Enzyme design. Sequence first.
Site, PDB file in Angstrom:
ATOM      1  N   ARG A 186     -15.605  11.923  -0.639  1.00 41.90           N
ATOM      2  CA  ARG A 186     -16.479  11.857   0.132  1.00 41.90           C
ATOM      3  C   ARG A 186     -16.242  12.792   1.691  1.00 41.90           C
ATOM      4  NH1 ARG A 186     -13.566   6.096  -0.795  1.00 41.90           N
ATOM      5  NH2 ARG A 186     -11.472   6.755  -0.296  1.00 41.90           N
ATOM      6  N   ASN A 228      -4.908  -5.620  -8.392  1.00 38.50           N
ATOM      7  CA  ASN A 228      -5.813  -5.163  -7.882  1.00 38.50           C
ATOM      8  C   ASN A 228      -7.161  -5.409  -8.080  1.00 38.50           C
ATOM      9  OD1 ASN A 228      -7.030  -3.925  -5.946  1.00 38.50           O
ATOM     10  ND2 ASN A 228      -6.174  -1.722  -6.681  1.00 38.50           N
ATOM     11  N   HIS A 253      -5.499   1.812   3.474  1.00 38.38           N
ATOM     12  CA  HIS A 253      -3.854   3.037   3.335  1.00 38.38           C
ATOM     13  C   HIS A 253      -2.525   2.401   3.737  1.00 38.38           C
ATOM     14  CE1 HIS A 253      -6.410   6.176   0.040  1.00 38.38           C
ATOM     15  NE2 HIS A 253      -7.115   6.237   1.883  1.00 38.38           N
ATOM     16  N   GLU A 289       2.789   1.058  -3.051  1.00 39.41           N
ATOM     17  CA  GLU A 289       2.365   0.023  -2.257  1.00 39.41           C
ATOM     18  C   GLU A 289       2.094  -1.578  -3.476  1.00 39.41           C
ATOM     19  OE1 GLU A 289      -1.682   2.361  -1.951  1.00 39.41           O
ATOM     20  OE2 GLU A 289      -1.616   0.979  -0.054  1.00 39.41           O
ATOM     21  N   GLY A 301      -0.624  14.413  -1.635  1.00 42.08           N
ATOM     22  CA  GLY A 301       0.479  14.496  -0.503  1.00 42.08           C
ATOM     23  C   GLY A 301       1.658  14.331  -1.362  1.00 42.08           C
ATOM     24  N   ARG A 310      -3.935  -7.430  -3.340  1.00 42.27           N
ATOM     25  CA  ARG A 310      -4.794  -6.287  -2.393  1.00 42.27           C
ATOM     26  C   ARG A 310      -6.084  -6.608  -1.861  1.00 42.27           C
ATOM     27  NH1 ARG A 310      -8.709  -1.634  -3.672  1.00 42.27           N
ATOM     28  NH2 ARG A 310      -7.899  -1.154  -2.178  1.00 42.27           N
ATOM     29  N   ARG A 360      -6.126  19.010  -8.396  1.00 40.47           N
ATOM     30  CA  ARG A 360      -5.279  20.057  -9.088  1.00 40.47           C
ATOM     31  C   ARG A 360      -5.795  21.737  -8.742  1.00 40.47           C
ATOM     32  NH1 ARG A 360      -5.007  17.763 -13.629  1.00 40.47           N
ATOM     33  NH2 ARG A 360      -6.213  15.946 -12.783  1.00 40.47           N
TER      34      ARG A 360
END
Lengths: 401, 398
Positions: free
Chosen positions: B241, B8, B180, B385, B333, B89, B285
């Site tokens: 973002r 990556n 994603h 992934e 998530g 990737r 967090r």
Amino acid sequence: HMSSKLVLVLNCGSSSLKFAIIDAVNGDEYLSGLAECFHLPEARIKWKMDGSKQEAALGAGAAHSEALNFIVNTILAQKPELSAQLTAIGHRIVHGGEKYTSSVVIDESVIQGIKDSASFAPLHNPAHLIGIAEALKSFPQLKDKNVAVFDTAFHQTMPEESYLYALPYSLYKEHGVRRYGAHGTSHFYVTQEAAKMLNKPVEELNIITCHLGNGGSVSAIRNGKCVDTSMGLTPLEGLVMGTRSGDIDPAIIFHLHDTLGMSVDQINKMLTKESGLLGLTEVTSDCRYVEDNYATKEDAKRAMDVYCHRLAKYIGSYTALMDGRLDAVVFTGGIGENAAMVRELSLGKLGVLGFEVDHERNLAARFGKSGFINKEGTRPAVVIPTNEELVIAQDASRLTA
Amino acid sequence: SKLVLVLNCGSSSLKFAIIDAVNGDEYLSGLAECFHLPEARIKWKMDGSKQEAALGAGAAHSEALNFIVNTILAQKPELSAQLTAIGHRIVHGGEKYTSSVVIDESVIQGIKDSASFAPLHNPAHLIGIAEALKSFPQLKDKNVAVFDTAFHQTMPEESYLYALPYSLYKEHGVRRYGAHGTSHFYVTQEAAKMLNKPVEELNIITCHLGNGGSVSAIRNGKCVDTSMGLTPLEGLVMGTRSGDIDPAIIFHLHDTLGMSVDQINKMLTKESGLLGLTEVTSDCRYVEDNYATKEDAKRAMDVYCHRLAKYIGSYTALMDGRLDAVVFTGGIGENAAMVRELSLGKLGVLGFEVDHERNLAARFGKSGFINKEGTRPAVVIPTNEELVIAQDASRLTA
């Protein structure tokens, strides 16, 4: 025992003036018209009164002054019994900021309030003030009986959860960057009517309201109050509209600027004047064209599908604001009242929620008719024709008379 | 034992791993960050315990991958012969690539053409490929590109078009592409296994929340809509973002507050989201731990959950009458129990009811149904992934 309370409704733009005389008590329209093409040789004024159609020109380079002059000295002069019967004047305001949560009586501080909110409506709000200034000069008698009615007022009940963008909080604290919405007057109206149609108190009303016409907005109503709406800082956000884009990847603006060489002003004019239904169909802004031709023309089908896709997702998104109960969905506005398939195709995508339109009922609820368009056993869906002019008249009357 | 080198590459950092594409076994991990700087260092965890070294001062991808060959794979030469493929990737595959492909010159050319959409990430991936082919000569015909945008290419025009002038798509490819994809794909396949039904009949909404946030609508195992757009900016609240905003806010900031396009672009991508809402940190967090005791965290939690809850709700318009489950994945998530609970708690009309005991258990790499027994399924599935990259790389070269 019975009474009339006639109010002059004015809707002022920089080149237009929509006017009407409504009896706030029962809703009777005595006069309605439109003065257009300001500061041009074409400058004309149209009106239906008794009511038949009349058209006249105010003269090359006509302003709002002669626009009210023609109403007072030409139109109202013929029927002086009508002129005397006026008890108030209502003004529609595009943007009322956070200061104005409801309709207010116009004074020096309201003039300033509209001026301060002008930051959010730089083109519309200045034009209101011209119209406000002319109504005080053309109608001296009603100088303390002018009322402001805000497109944004109804959306001020929104909680922070809904009005805040995920931007720097300082941008809200010191610059007022917030979700304000529009069509508030219409959103209010159809909520009150949905109470009648669902035979329940407005206080207990959980509905999702869709005003689709000159602009498009969806709102989430919880217990009679608005808790979220589709338009944002400005009317640009949300639904696919006649000429406006609605939701886009914000980064597109940067891609148009840095990759495609378009100026901020060029991009602004594109998203506002060249996008939406004109964008999708490289032909027209008119929803009537798409409604009729989506079965026979590719450009009309792609426009319809994107449109209905956008609408269905907004209705669906407001389930997050319903706290476990959705009484009905409401359709209103030029498109919302007339465009049967837009209602059928967008609700048909929401089977998960319990939505499905009856074709026979959907067609029946057009051109002024109100009705339930849902299939039996399915979640209620109502067409309710809106009346923004009436709300302005009612508010102007209540606060003055 | 099908071993794959997963790469990556970015502007200043190469992230790398050797994964067994048969069972997901990690044999090596790494990160060669701070390229072209004095802070040029490496952090390579392995089957044999981890360590950190320094690459040098003013380093590049060529040195990173060579350091893997001459030093990292020098101590462990048993797994060097075991390498069967290399996985890359890629951020943007454009419209061309709907699945992962074997890298030839047309793919290099394809990534170059797409680089208009990822101007920072795609040219960097090319340098990564370039060095991978020369540093690993043996595997020059066994490099596979996996695209973050590939999975969303099954989108109909109904979903991928913006209500902009149609010429912008026609002439310039302005379109919804998303991200994603490798994650949305993975958790889709897993959800089928957990729901004991075929993927080809699977109607789910997937939520990848972590380094960026994205929701996807899946019908019959195929993505039909996604929250991110032309670029990853659109959609959910994220670390820095903004996600969805009234497009006009940009024009307001520019014309009323005198901000430059660059300044607004920076703000929206680096000064907004959770960092914007809580004027403290991008770290989620903080929001998870303090939403009950601190105003700034609460503000950010409510606005975050509001955006997520609405997105899940909006994708009922894509399910065509049937929603099987909602899936939670990613750094956030998988681990943020209350984020999952507060947003799904807003969707009661839909029949969602979080079981708190189940919710708390499904954390820290653990999968599980977090819904109450008679209620609409909600699942947490930890994404992988790198394994999907390994699998695609290995499967397309056998």
